[PDB]
């Protein structure tokens, strides 16, 4: 209300298309977490639920980022077996 | 089904075999048809290589058949084309110079064009959500639209016709009525469009 307008959360179209510009805006909000934040602010969650939600988000983030490393670590072991029928 | 999975649908068009040298890819298609030694089903009784048949006529003839009287269905279809031809010939004679070369005297041309105007463009299918059914419009496939047009023609001429008027003559009238975009079947097609357009906001329910 006090800041200047048409600076924050604003994109400009190029070559006359609007679908592409809108998707760029959505990626900006999704990366910054505003899209999920608006979803959670439609209703009110008690502080008991908020901590229970962050204890599940953090656990998923640890497991997903640890399984991902093992996948990349073992990714090179997918070539054709040189000792088939050995 | 006495035919196994290896059997395929035979090709009936004679012209497909008489001029194969003008194309190369199509030559590879049928040269491998027997080179793979794939079995071929027996020729159907209804379909024949006669140049005077038409696939749309056979399907329409089959639908009119009740029980197993193919001869009676063929007889009714023969008279209906004759009945249309007589009416068109009579109207041609009583016409002016500019009106003479407007009237079509080909029953096959009329029959093909009549069905292409009675086919609905967008249909309806009930969808259950929230314990209630909502009529959700869908882009019906071409085969369904072609089938639905034939069924409407048969249903109309069987129900609301008088007892005295014969079947071949009553169906002949509707073919001319549909050829001019004024038959009751065209009205029924528009009625289905009326309901589909009214429920245009419910198209989001469908998931395909």
């Amino acid at each position: 209300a006090n800041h200047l307008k048409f600076i924050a959360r604003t994109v400009m179209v190029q070559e006359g298309n609007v679908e592409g510009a809108y998707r760029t805006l959505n990626r900006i909000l999704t990366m910054d977490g505003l899209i999920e934040d608006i979803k959670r602010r439609r209703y009110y969650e008690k502080p008991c639920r908020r901590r229970q939600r962050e204890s599940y988000e953090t656990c998923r983030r640890i497991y997903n980022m640890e399984m991902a490393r093992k996948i990349n670590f073992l990714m090179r072991k997918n070539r054709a077996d040189p000792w088939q029928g050995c | 089904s006495r035919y196994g999975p290896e059997y395929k649908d035979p090709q009936i068009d004679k012209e497909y075999y008489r001029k194969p040298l003008a194309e190369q890819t199509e030559e590879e298609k049928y040269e491998r048809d027997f080179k793979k030694t794939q079995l071929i089903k027996a020729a159907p009784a209804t379909k024949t290589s006669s140049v005077f048949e038409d696939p749309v006529i056979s399907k329409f003839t089959n639908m009119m058949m009740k029980g197993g009287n193919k001869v009676l269905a063929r007889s009714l279809m023969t008279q209906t084309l004759e009945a249309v031809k007589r009416k068109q010939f009579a109207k041609y004679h009583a016409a002016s110079a500019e009106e003479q070369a407007t009237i079509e005297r080909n029953p096959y041309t009329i029959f093909h064009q009549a069905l292409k105007n009675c086919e609905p463009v967008i249909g309806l299918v009930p969808i259950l959500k929230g314990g209630h059914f909502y009529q959700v419009p869908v882009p019906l496939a071409d085969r369904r639209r072609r089938f639905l047009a034939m069924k409407w023609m048969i249903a109309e001429c069987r129900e609301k016709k008088h007892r005295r008027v014969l079947m071949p003559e009553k169906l002949s009238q509707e073919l001319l009525e549909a050829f001019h975009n004024q038959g009751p079947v065209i009205k029924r097609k528009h009625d289905m469009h009326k309901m589909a357009e009214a429920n245009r906001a419910l198209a989001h329910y469908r998931w395909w």
Binding site: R9, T10, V11, M12, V18, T24, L25, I38, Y43 | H204
Partner: protein, 137 residues
């Protein structure tokens, strides 16, 4: 062709004029895409309203007006009324998150109106009024 996503700052002087006028002179199209209705209003550079349109005013009623098609029709009607007053380019501001955000954006494009900049001004409290309780549906 160097194109910058960021808007031209009014303090600087950018030689990028649409229809002979600067960036700030171009009218504004406010879009409020709620969860049950979509309201579209176009205002001039001096914040003077030109035309107003919404799903309710276009004949849609009750749950129907909350669908995307209802917002799409409103954008076409709003652009048609706006184009009558002689506006070519407009800066669209999107308010809130709802099912009608995409439809209203392309509704103006197909209505004879051209957009050049997109702004999202969803009300985001920073700690604010306590919202309603949850729904145990």
């Amino acid at each position: 062709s160097s194109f910058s996503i960021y808007p031209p700052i009014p303090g600087q002087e950018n030689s990028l004029r649409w229809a002979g006028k600067k960036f700030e002179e171009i009218p504004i199209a406010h879009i409020k895409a709620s969860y049950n209705n979509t309201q579209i209003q176009v205002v001039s550079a001096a914040h003077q309203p030109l035309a107003h349109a919404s799903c309710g005013t276009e004949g849609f009623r009750n749950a129907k007006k909350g669908t995307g098609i209802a917002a799409q029709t409103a954008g076409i009607a709003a652009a048609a009324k706006a184009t009558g007053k002689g506006v070519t380019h407009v800066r669209v501001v999107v308010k809130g998150l709802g099912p009608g955000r995409l439809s209203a954006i392309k509704g103006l494009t197909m209505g004879g109106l051209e957009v050049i900049s997109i702004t999202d001004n969803t009300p985001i409290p920073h700690x604010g009024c306590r919202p309603r309780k949850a729904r145990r549906l």
